[PDB]
Amino acid sequence: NAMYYGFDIGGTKIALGVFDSTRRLQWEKRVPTPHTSYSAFLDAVCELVEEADQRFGVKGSVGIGIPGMPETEDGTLYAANVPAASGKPLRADLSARLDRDVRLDNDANCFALSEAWDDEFTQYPLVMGLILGTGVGGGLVLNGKPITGQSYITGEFGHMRLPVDALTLMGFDFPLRRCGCGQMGCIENYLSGRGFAWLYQHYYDQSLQAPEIIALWEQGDEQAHAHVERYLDLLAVCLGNILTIVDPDLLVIGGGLSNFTAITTQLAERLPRHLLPVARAPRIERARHGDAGGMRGAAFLHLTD
Ligand code: NA
Ligand SMILES: [Zn+2]
Secondary structure, three states, rough: OOOEEEEEOOOOEEEEEEEEEEOOEEEEEEEEEEOHHHHHHHHHHHHHHHHHHHHHHOEEEEEEEEOOOOOOOOOEOOOOOOOOOOOOOOOHHHHHHHOOOEEEHHHHHHHHHHOOOOOOOHOOOOEEEEEOOOEEEEEEEEEEEEEEOOOOOOOOOOHOEEOOHHHHHHOOOOOOEOOOOEEOOOOOOHHOOOHHHHHHHHOOOOOOOOHHHHHHHHOOOOOOHHHHHHHHHHHHHHHHHHHHEEEEEEEEEOHHHHHHHHHHHHHHHHHHHHHOOOOOOOOEEOOOOOHHHHHHHHHHHHOOO
């Protein structure tokens, strides 16, 4: 009768999803994220766990996805959009309040874990989740457990510089854009939704956003088509480098751009030219649990020891 609770904590709302032992969602509830004080934040979360416990007559396990640093070396959380909890030992405090092992991970790792636990995808030991949306990020999952790395940096694909073969493709004068992290040329600024739009403007001198370019592509516009071919080629070159070091069985692509089917259907054929001769491309799939993934991944933190 084990139940798995998963919280997706964002700047606006705290979303709880409750899953049974077969990973099916049984109940959902969302409340506003308190920003006023840590005590109000702790209560928002604990009251939801208590409500679920009462509703299902069980002590559910509790997993939580955080957009930031879940637990530093000393046990401290840091998240820009969750000021009420930042600087606090969230994991320890919630664990004491709920008398159970509350587990935390970042939102990109929860996204990857949610996909790795899709019924069909559990057959793949090593799953790489790639998010192409507001930013670029992701995570790595091995045998159903996320690989967090020393500081929850594993899977920060958006912050690896363009490889030199991107200059061979685009020209050596291709702009190396300044990233928010401070480096020059991070792939996030070419492959995110904004990067996709920037690349269009770079070639065509028109300020269209991704939806608009996609609309033109669907209507058969020649520029939009030429733009998408370049984007896909650049995505492939960048992925060639990542896949050569990670070698995942499955690459699942999520985020806003993943709704553009060309990104997951026309990518596989472009990979072999950037992979080792003896390498096989990973299976490539569009994410299957967009909306519910934050809650699923958080809940799934308790599916492994
Ligand atoms: Na209240
Ligand atoms: Zn960067």
